[PDB]
Amino acid sequence: KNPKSDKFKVKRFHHIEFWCGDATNVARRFSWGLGMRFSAKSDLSTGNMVHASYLLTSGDLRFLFTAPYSPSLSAGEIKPTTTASIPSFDHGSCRSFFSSHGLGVRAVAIEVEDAESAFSISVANGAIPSSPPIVLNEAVTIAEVKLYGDVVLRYVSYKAEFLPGFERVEDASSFPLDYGIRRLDHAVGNVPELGPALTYVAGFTGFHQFAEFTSGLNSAVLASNDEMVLLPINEPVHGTKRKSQIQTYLEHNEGAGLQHLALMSEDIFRTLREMRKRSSIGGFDFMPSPPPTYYQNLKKRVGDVLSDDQIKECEELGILVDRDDQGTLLQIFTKPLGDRPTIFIEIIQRVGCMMYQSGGCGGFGKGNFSELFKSIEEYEK
Amino acid sequence: KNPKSDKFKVKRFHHIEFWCGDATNVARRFSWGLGMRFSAKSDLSTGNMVHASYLLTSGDLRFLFTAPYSPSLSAGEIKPTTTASIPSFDHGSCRSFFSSHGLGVRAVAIEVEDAESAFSISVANGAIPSSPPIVLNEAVTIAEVKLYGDVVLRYVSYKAEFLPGFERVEDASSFPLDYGIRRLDHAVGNVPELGPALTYVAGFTGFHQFAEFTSGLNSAVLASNDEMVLLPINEPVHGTKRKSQIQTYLEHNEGAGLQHLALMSEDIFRTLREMRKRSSIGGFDFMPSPPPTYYQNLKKRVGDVLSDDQIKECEELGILVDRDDQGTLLQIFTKPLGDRPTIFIEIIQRVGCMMYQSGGCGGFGKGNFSELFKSIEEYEK
Numbered sequence: 225k226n227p228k229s230d231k232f233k234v235k236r237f238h239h240i241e242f243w244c245g246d247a248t249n250v251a252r253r254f255s256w257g258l259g260m261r262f263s264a265k266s267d268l269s270t271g272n273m274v275h276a277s278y279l280l281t282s283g284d285l286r287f288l289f290t291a292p293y294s295p296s297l298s299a300g301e302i303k304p305t306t307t308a309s310i311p312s313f314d315h316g317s318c319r320s321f322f323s324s325h326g327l328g329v330r331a332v333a334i335e336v337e338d339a340e341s342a343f344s345i346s347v348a349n350g351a352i353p354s355s356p357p358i359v360l361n362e363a364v365t366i367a368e369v370k371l372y373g374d375v376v377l378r379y380v381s382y383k384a385e386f387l388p389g390f391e392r393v394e395d396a397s398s399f400p401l402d403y404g405i406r407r408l409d410h411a412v413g414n415v416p417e418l419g420p421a422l423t424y425v426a427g428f429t430g431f432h433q434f435a436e437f438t439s440g441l442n443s444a445v446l447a448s449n450d451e452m453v454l455l456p457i458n459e460p461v462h463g464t465k466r467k468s469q470i471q472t473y474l475e476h477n478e479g480a481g482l483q484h485l486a487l488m489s490e491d492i493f494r495t496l497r498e499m500r501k502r503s504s505i506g507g508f509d510f511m512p513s514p515p516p517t518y519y520q521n522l523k524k525r526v527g528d529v530l531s532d533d534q535i536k537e538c539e540e541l542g543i544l545v546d547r548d549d550q551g552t553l554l555q556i557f558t559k560p561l562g563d564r565p566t567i568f569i570e571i572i573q574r575v576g577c578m579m580y581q582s583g584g585c586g587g588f589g590k591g592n593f594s595e596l597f598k599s600i601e602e603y604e605k
Numbered sequence: 606k607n608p609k610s611d612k613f614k615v616k617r618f619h620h621i622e623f624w625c626g627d628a629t630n631v632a633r634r635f636s637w638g639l640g641m642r643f644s645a646k647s648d649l650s651t652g653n654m655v656h657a658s659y660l661l662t663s664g665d666l667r668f669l670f671t672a673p674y675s676p677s678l679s680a681g682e683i684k685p686t687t688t689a690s691i692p693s694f695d696h697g698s699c700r701s702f703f704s705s706h707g708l709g710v711r712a713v714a715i716e717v718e719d720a721e722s723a724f725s726i727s728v729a730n731g732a733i734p735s736s737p738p739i740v741l742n743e744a745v746t747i748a749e750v751k752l753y754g755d756v757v758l759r760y761v762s763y764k765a766e767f768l769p770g771f772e773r774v775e776d777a778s779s780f781p782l783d784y785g786i787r788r789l790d791h792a793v794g795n796v797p798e799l800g801p802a803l804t805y806v807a808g809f810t811g812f813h814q815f816a817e818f819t820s821g822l823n824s825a826v827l828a829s830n831d832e833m834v835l836l837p838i839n840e841p842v843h844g845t846k847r848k849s850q851i852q853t854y855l856e857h858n859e860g861a862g863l864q865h866l867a868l869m870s871e872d873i874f875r876t877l878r879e880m881r882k883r884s885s886i887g888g889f890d891f892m893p894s895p896p897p898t899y900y901q902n903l904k905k906r907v908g909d910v911l912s913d914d915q916i917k918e919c920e921e922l923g924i925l926v927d928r929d930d931q932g933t934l935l936q937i938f939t940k941p942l943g944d945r946p947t948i949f950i951e952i953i954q955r956v957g958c959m960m961y962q963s964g965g966c967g968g969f970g971k972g973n974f975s976e977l978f979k980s981i982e983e984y985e986k
């Protein structure tokens with residue numbers, strides 16, 4: 225069921241913002257490893273004395289990397305005279321975030337039709353305000369509320385090119401990398417308490433429950449009206465023989481935060497060929513591939529969706545496959561993106577649910593816990 | 606003249622340590638951009654709960670990238686029970702360094718025959734102690750004194766594989782990149798006051814004056830007995846029409862610090878071909894190339910050292926050339942390595958002074974200030 229109970233008009237995921245120590249090095253690493261182009265900047269060269277922010281894009285996916293300059297560069301500024309392009313930015317908040325959590329997502333940004341209305345309705349329905357609505361150049365409105373931990377849900381609305389004050393980058397510096405990634409499919413948070421987290425977020429958004437799972441975790445997914453904005457949330461389950469991976473996240477992250485970003489590819493085979501070629505030359509590493517027994521068991525589960533040859537390519541690339549009663553899911557997971565065993569990336573491609581493809585087609589891969597475990601045992605033999 | 610007045614036995618540059626927010630992303634960016642292999646690690650996977658440290662190597666050049674984990678992981682440790690592999694490391698010092706200066710060099714490490722003796726002699730001759738001599742696994746001794754700003758001169762001595770507690774990395778993760786870089790040639794500091802800086806460092810090392818320069822700066826170079834450890838130091842000169850680039854460094858860096866690392870290549874043409882291919886795909890950018898008038902004037906200055914074809918290759922790659930009465934210097938400069946206009950890298954190759962090649966053969970390029978300026982004017986025409 226979909227009660228379509230959004231309390232304001234939500235469109236799509238807009239961007240993800242990482243708070244960094246050095247935005248330059250993280251942005252360059254991510255650009256090469258994921259095949260994202262440098263598309264906009266806001267920094268000393270654009271008159272911003274407060275923060276360095278670099279925008280990578282691949283299709284509709286937007287990754288923003290931001291780091292603070294020395295506060296001394298802007299010591300004479302006040303908010304009415306700021307040279308910051310993102311008015312919610314604060315040197316102390318950013319340094320405190322990074323000291324506490326390390327490299328990670330500060331903002332999950334969704335485009336809405338009116339960010340001031342979304343903020344007002346959200347706060348009236350229980351959201352904790354983080355940054356009030358600010359109109360940039362009479363063109364864009366931006367506002368932020370707390371989502372979980374020190375992650376904010378950012379609302380962006382456009383009257384009508386990322387944000388005012390950002391400049392398109394020199395095409396000499398803008399190499400047209402593209403490994404096939406096209407949009408953000410979902411963004412997953414880890415929290416200590418799922419119930420209160422869900423009640424809070426669904427309370428102020430009107431997002432509805434899309435999925436739920438009850439090893440080592442409990443999970444539920446909140447969705448917008450057209451189920452294009454998808455926000456899974458996990459909690460640890462204590463008492464299993466193996467320690468909860470969610471608890472390990474919370475320990476190393478110093479609390480709740482964003483666990484993974486799932487990036488939709490229009491050609492997951494090409495995306496993984498390109499990413500795996502670069503893993504050891506500055507790119508991203510991938511989690512260990514499942515045993516050959518996993519791929520032999522794949523024929524019986526999805527042999528009507530994927531040819532043997534396509535299953536063989538999944539095996540070459542370490543790709544996992546899951547399927548519900550409506551669609552089929554191809555997915556794979558990177559190792560953590562930075563020093564701490566916290567945030568990682570998922571590459572996903574979905575098959576089915578054509579009408580456009582409906583959001584969340586095929587689920588989130590929960591069947592792969594069981595099937596991975598079974599394959600583990602079968603391969604040990 | 607070389608009075609050979611070193612107060613203890615110094616061998617060669619050993620390594621450079623960067624203090625980072627996220628060591629993983631900086632190390633991966635640098636590996637790809639400079640062609641350095643991942644060769645050792647000390648992190649959670651090696652039992653280090655305190656800091657993440659990754660070692661890149663190219664020939665004899667060693668770059669170490671270190672970042673702190675959450676202090677909570679090691680909250681029960683004391684120094685006698687530490688899991689840190691670098692005993693001088695301190696969470697608060699590292700976070701304070703990075704907040705103040707951004708990404709940059711914390712340690713210039715030189716190998717000596719006895720780090721305890723070097724430390725004791727240095728402090729007895731005026732050095733400010735930073736970390737006392739500590740013996741690691743009865744095999745390596747490490748000690749640190751202040752050099753300038755928050756940069757330390759680190760002494761390392763070996764009884765006889767980087768440091769105990771570091772592990773060689775999986776060869777799957779160790780891609781054998783190599784663009785030709787072979788060793789650290791010199792490491793340059795920017796300070797507010799050159800006189801006191803020189804008196805301090807020469808006072809505790811016995812290093813002698815190798816070179817001196819008196820636009821926008823004054824500079825002098827301190828050298829070890831065999832002039833293989835070379836430490837130029839710059840101060841700003843105020844009052845010129847254009848603002849001192851050294852002063853700009855000091856403002857953005859919040860004080861004195863390391864300005865550039867000059868990396869010797871055994872084939873500067875190959876190094877620059879490889880680095881320039883990667884500038885816009887995660888590597889390093891280079892400063893603007895000199896006008897064609899610079900390279901036409903090169904024939905008259907070094908036409909006995911470099912053929913026309915080799916001069917044409919210098920022009921293709923933006924390489925600068927200088928020459929003294931003893932040798933010839935090929936050099937080029939990157940744009941800043943991170944967000945702030947502070948630290949950058951120089952690639953260098955020296956021709957001449959064969960006997961082995963004597964250190965500092967050809968100087969440091971001071972003739973290129975004048976010749977660049979002249980070329981500037983000639984090209985405007």
Ligand SMILES: CCN1C(=O)[C@H](O)[C@@H](C(=O)c2ccc(Cl)c(OCc3ccccc3)c2Cl)[C@H]1C
Pocket residue numbers: 410412437443445456457469484486511557558568570588589590592593596
């Ligand atoms: C339970 C509800 N879920 C969501 O809603 C999610 O989007 C989702 C998901 O993507 C997913 C699906 C299958 C597996 Cl096997 C998996 O773990 C991989 C892994 C193990 C160890 C270290 C790194 C990564 C994940 Cl993380 C899942 C968590």
Ligand SMILES: CCN1C(=O)[C@H](O)[C@@H](C(=O)c2ccc(Cl)c(OCc3ccccc3)c2Cl)[C@H]1C
Pocket residue numbers: 791793818824826837838850865867892938939949951969970971973974977
């Ligand atoms: C004066 C004594 N010197 C040393 O001892 C040094 O090693 C040395 C050196 O390497 C050098 C040589 C020629 C030039 Cl043109 C130059 O500036 C390039 C540049 C300009 C603007 C932004 C980035 C880089 C440098 Cl930095 C020099 C400073």
Ligand SMILES: [Co+2]
Pocket residue numbers: 410412484486570588
């Ligand atoms: Co997922």
Ligand SMILES: [Co+2]
Pocket residue numbers: 791793865867951969
């Ligand atoms: Co130099």
